[PDB]
C-alpha cells in the first residue's frame, strides 16, 4: 500500500472567469482556445477590459489532482503560490479537496499566478495567464518522499515556460523510476507544444515519460501534420501509453499496436470547456491506479470530462465518485 | 438630467461560496438563513472546515447597485475595501458592471471583508461575515456631489454593525433631502433588525427613510409579531413606501392605504437564494427611478430576484435588461 495514487505537478493558478463575445477576442488579439502568456502590464490592461468575473482555483495539474481526490483516489500536488490572498485561496481549495499540498511560498512577490479566462458563446475558453510566483518553482520544491510514494507522477507541458520547473521534473522522473513508479505528462496546449516540441519528444523517447495525454490539436502540433492518423501512429511509437482526446468524438487509448476507442458521454450543453482535458486525465489516472483496463480508464476520463464542461469553473462541484457509481463504472 | 438613478451604500464584501449538508450548520452553530457576524479567529476556523469554494463579489448593496446597472439604470456605490487582492477584485467587478465606485481604500489592514456563504440542498444560504475594512467606512467616504445627484440613495440595515457607517448615512439623508431626493433602506436580516429595532423605526418615523425594503421574516422581527397582516399594517404606517417580499409568494408594495401584490416568477429549481432580496431591490429601484407604477416596480423586482436564485453567486451573469424586454416590462 502506497501513500499516493497520483502526484501532479504544475503551475499553481487562480482563474478569473468571464463571458465575452467573439469580437472581444479579435479586438484584444487573444488566440481563441489557447493559453496566452501575458506580462504584468498586459494583465492589468486585459483586466481593465474584462467584465464582472468569478474566481476559482485552477492550474491544469491542480484541477487533475482535485479530480482524482473527488473520484476517491489519493492525490498530491507540487506547485508554487505567493504568500498572498490568492495563494491562500489556492492552498485552501486544493487541501480542502483532500489533496496533499505542502509547497511553501517564498514571499509575497511575485504574486500568485492568475489566468483570465474568457468563455465564448460556443463554450470555448481562451486563457490569459500571468505566471507570477510560478516562475519560482524549482528542484527545492520536490518532496522526494512524495514522489517515491506515488504510483503515478503527472506533470504539465506548461511547466516548460517557467525557467526552473523542468529541473524539478527531471528530479521527479529520476526518483519515480528509481522507486518503480510511472511518469506521465500532458502536452497541455498546441502552442506550448510548438515552443517545446523537441524537448517533449525527448522526454518520451528517453523514457522519462511513460504515459502521455494529448488532444487532437496537440498531437497534430507535436508532429506538425494535418493527418490525424499519422499523429496517432507516431505518438504510439514515441511513448508506452498514449491517451488522445478528441472532444465530442471521445478518446482513443493507444499502447503499442492496441487501440481502445471510447465515446463522449451525452451532454446537456457545453457551458464552459475549461478543465475538460484536466478532468479526462483525472478519470484516466484514477482508473489506471485502481488497476482498471485501459478502456475503463478511457470511460472514466470521458465521464469526468463530460461533467466538468457542463459547469462554469475547472473543478467539478459535484461528486465524481457518485456519478461513476451511477454510470456503472464505479 | 441627473447623474445617478440609484446610489447604494453598504458593506463591501467578497463572497466565498460552498455547498454543505444540514449537519454542517448544526455542528458549527451557524444560524441557518442568517447573516452571522464573525471575528478574524472564527473566520480562519470556519474556512479550515469549509470545502473547495468559489469567490465572487458580494455586499448586499453592492449587488443591488450592480443589478440597477445591469437593467440599464445609472448606479453609484459607496463602500470600503482594503488595498489588497480581494479589494482589487471587488473594485474591478462593481466598476466593470458600469457602477460609479470611487471609495478609496485606507490601508491593507483590516483586510477586505469576506463572507463564507454555505448553501444547503434546499438552496438556502447561511452567511458568515468578517467585516474587515468595512469597519472604517465613515462620513469621510460620503461623496456629497454623488448623493446630491442621485434620484434615490439606498442603504443596508447591515451598516448599523460597523461603528461609524451610521454617521455617513445620516450625512447622506441630510444631503439627499436637501436636494429633493429620496432615501431608501433595507432591513437586511431579521437578527440585524433585532439588534437595531428602535433605531430602524426611528429612521422611518423621522422621515430619514422614505422607502423601506423588508422580507416576511424582517417584517415580523421589526414588530416582534407572528401576525404578518399586523406587520404589513404597521410598516405601512411607519414609512411612505414599503416593499415587502414573501419569497415564493411574491411581493406586496404598500403606500398609505394602497396595496399592490405581485406574483413570484415560477421556478425550475432554486439553486442558491443568495442575492434574492438585493436584486428585488435592483428591479424595484430601477422601475421607481424610471417613473414606473408601484406594481411594475414590484414586477421588475420579482423578475430580477427570480433570475438570481437560479444561479450560483449573488450578481446575475445574464442580461437583466434582455430578460425584462422579453417579459414586456422593458
Ligand atoms: N500556463 C499555465 N499552466 C498551467 N495551467 C494553466 C496555465 N494557463 C491556464 N491554466 C489553467 O488551465 C486550466 C484549464 O485546463 C485552468 O483552470 C487554468 O487555471
Ligand atoms: N454584514 C453584511 N453586510 C452587508 N452585506 C452582507 C453582509 N454579510 C453578507 N452580505 C452579503 O449579502 C449578500 C446576499 O444578500 C451576499 O453577497 C453577501 O456578500
Ligand atoms: C474527451 C473530452 O475532452 N471530453 C469532452 C470534450 C468535449 C465534449 C465532450 C462531449 C461533447 C463536447 C466531451
Ligand atoms: C419576491 C422574491 O424575492 N422572489 C423570490 C424569492 C425567493 C423565491 C422565489 C421563488 C422561489 C424562492 C421568488
Ligand atoms: K468548466
Ligand atoms: K444566487
TrEMBL record, chains A, B:
Gene Ontology MF annotations: kinase activity; nucleotide binding
Electron transport in keyword set: no
Organism domain of life: Bacteria
Alphabetized Pfam families for the sequence: PfkB
UniProt domain Carbohydrate kinase PfkB: residue ranges: 57-316
Sorted UniProt keywords: Kinase, Nucleotide-binding, Transferase
Keyword Repressor among UniProt keywords: no
Gene3D superfamilies (UniProt xref): 3.40.1190.20
Residues that hold adenosine according to the record: 11, 15, 59, 63, 129, 156, 158, 278
Residues binding ADP, per UniProt: 215, 245, 247, 250, 277, 302
Family affiliation: Belongs to the carbohydrate kinase PfkB family.
Protein name: Probable sugar kinase protein
Amino acid at each position: 500500500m502506497t501513500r499516493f495514487d497520483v502526484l501532479t505537478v504544475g503551475n499553481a493558478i487562480v482563474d478569473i472567469i468571464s463571458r465575452c463575445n467573439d469580437q472581444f477576442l479579435i479586438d484584444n488579439q487573444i488566440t481563441k482556445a489557447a493559453m496566452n502568456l501575458i506580462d504584468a502590464e498586459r494583465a492589468e490592461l486585459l483586466y481593465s477590459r474584462m467584465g464582472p468575473a468569478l474566481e476559482a482555483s485552477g492550474g491544469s495539474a491542480g484541477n487533475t489532482a482535485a479530480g482524482v481526490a473527488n473520484l476517491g483516489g489519493k492525490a498530491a500536488y507540487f506547485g508554487n503560490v505567493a504568500a498572498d490572498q490568492l495563494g491562500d485561496i489556492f492552498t485552501h481549495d486544493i487541501r480542502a479537496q483532500g489533496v496533499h499540498y505542502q509547497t511553501k511560498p517564498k514571499g509575497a512577490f511575485p504574486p500568485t499566478a492568475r489566468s483570465m479566462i474568457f468563455v465564448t458563446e460556443d463554450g470555448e475558453r481562451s486563457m490569459n495567464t500571468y505566471l507570477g510566483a510560478c516562475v519560482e518553482l524549482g528542484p527545492e520544491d520536490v518532496e522526494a518522499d512524495v514522489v517515491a510514494d506515488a504510483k503515478v507522477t503527472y506533470f504539465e507541458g506548461y511547466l516548460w515556460d517557467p525557467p526552473r520547473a523542468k529541473e524539478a521534473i527531471l528530479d521527479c522522473a529520476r526518483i519515480a523510476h528509481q522507486h518503480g513508479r510511472e511518469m506521465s505528462m500532458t502536452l497541455s496546449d498546441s502552442f506550448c507544444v510548438d515552443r517545446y516540441r523537441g524537448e517533449f519528444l525527448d522526454l518520451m523517447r528517453s523514457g522519462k515519460v511513460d504515459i502521455v495525454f494529448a488532444n487532437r490539436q496537440e498531437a497534430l502540433s507535436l508532429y506538425q501534420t494535418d493527418d490525424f492518423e499519422e499523429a496517432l501512429n507516431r505518438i504510439a511509437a514515441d511513448c508506452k501509453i498514449a491517451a488522445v482526446t478528441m472532444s465530442e468524438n471521445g478518446a482513443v487509448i493507444l499502447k503499442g499496436r492496441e487501440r481502445y476507442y471510447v465515446n463522449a458521454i451525452r451532454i446537456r450543453e457545453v457551458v464552459d470547456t475549461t478543465g475538460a482535458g484536466d478532468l479526462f486525465a483525472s478519470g484516466f489516472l484514477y482508473g489506471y491506479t485502481q488497476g482498471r483496463s485501459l478502456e475503463d480508464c478511457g470511460k472514466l476520463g470521458c465521464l469526468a470530462a463530460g461533467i466538468v464542461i457542463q459547469q462554469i469553473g475547472p473543478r467539478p462541484m459535484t461528486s465524481l465518485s457518485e456519478a461513476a457509481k451511477q454510470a456503472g463504472l464505479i
